[PDB]
Amino acid sequence: TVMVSSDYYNRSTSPWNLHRNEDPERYPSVIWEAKCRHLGCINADGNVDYHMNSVPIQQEILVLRREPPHSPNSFRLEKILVSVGCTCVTPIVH
Amino acid sequence: RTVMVNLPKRSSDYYNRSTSPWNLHRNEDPERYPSVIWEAKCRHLGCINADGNVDYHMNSVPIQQEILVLRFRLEKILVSVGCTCVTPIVH
Ligand SMILES: c1ccc(CNc2cncc(-c3ccc4[nH]nc(NCCN5CCOCC5)c4c3)c2)cc1
Ligand SMILES: c1ccc(CNc2cncc(-c3ccc4[nH]nc(NCCN5CCOCC5)c4c3)c2)cc1
Numbered sequence: 001t002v003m004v005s006s007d008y009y010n011r012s013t014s015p016w017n018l019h020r021n022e023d024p025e026r027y028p029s030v031i032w033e034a035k036c037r038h039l040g041c042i043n044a045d046g047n048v049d050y051h052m053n054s055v056p057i058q059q060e061i062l063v064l065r066r067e068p069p070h071s072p073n074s075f076r077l078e079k080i081l082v083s084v085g086c087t088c089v090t091p092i093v094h
Numbered sequence: 095r096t097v098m099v100n101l102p103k104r105s106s107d108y109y110n111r112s113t114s115p116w117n118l119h120r121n122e123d124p125e126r127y128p129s130v131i132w133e134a135k136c137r138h139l140g141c142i143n144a145d146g147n148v149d150y151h152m153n154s155v156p157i158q159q160e161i162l163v164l165r166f167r168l169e170k171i172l173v174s175v176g177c178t179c180v181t182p183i184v185h
Contacts, residue, residue, distance in 0.1 A: 001098070002164070004099050004166040004168050008180055011180040028162070062127065064097075073098055077164075084159040085178055087114060087176055088178070090113075
């Protein structure tokens with residue numbers, strides 16, 4: 001108890017889409033959440049190479065959820081997993 | 095406004111298996127929440143081709159994420175989470 005622009009998503013070889021994550025009893029209110037565009041990965045010709053995997057990369061973030069519910073003064077410190085982007089990986093059996 | 099508050103990168107393998115692999119640097123701080131923050135650092139500037147060699151005509155770039163940090167004062171820092179492989183703006 002304590003009192004208190006980027007263009008990679010569309011250029012990647014593992015491009016991703018971006019989603020909003022709304023919750024009014026939470027600070028920050030909206031979080032951009034990435035979603036891998038492809039299963040495989042874009043090759044030199046710009047087609048999908050299914051020999052490779054687009055995989056979402058995640059980050060643990062702290063978030064303040066209002067408690068009691070819908071309270072502008074009291075919050076609970078939470079941890080949620082948020083996909084921030086996609087990388088291209090070799091499958092474990094390549 | 096003053097307010098009242100109640101109080102994967104250790105198990106993932108994409109970092110060593112990516113075409114834009116990355117390094118991890120651990121930041122321990124006792125006077126912070128989170129105490130521990132792993133910051134990703136692109137291994138190469140180029141990307142890895144089929145033969146495990148670096149293609150310097152593609153770019154490893156770090157993906158950033160704004161996260162909340164408590165010191166109490168609530169702060170926002172940018173943390174590199176991993177690296178993706180991008181076509182340079184002129185390819
Ligand atoms: C290391 C790492 C990766 C590789 C191979 N991987 C790769 C290499 N070099 C460029 C791209 C690459 C990446 C992203 C793209 N997006 N669009 C691209 N090309 C336009 C396609 N369009 C389709 C629709 O018709 C209009 C044209 C396009 C190309 C991908 C080699 C070595
Ligand atoms: C879409 C996106 C990207 C591409 C090209 N990008 C790529 C494709 N497929 C595998 C790797 C990749 C990634 C990481 C690795 N680490 N080691 C690798 N290969 C070791 C090879 N051996 C060296 C010693 O001689 C025997 C052979 C190795 C390969 C990289 C194509 C299409």
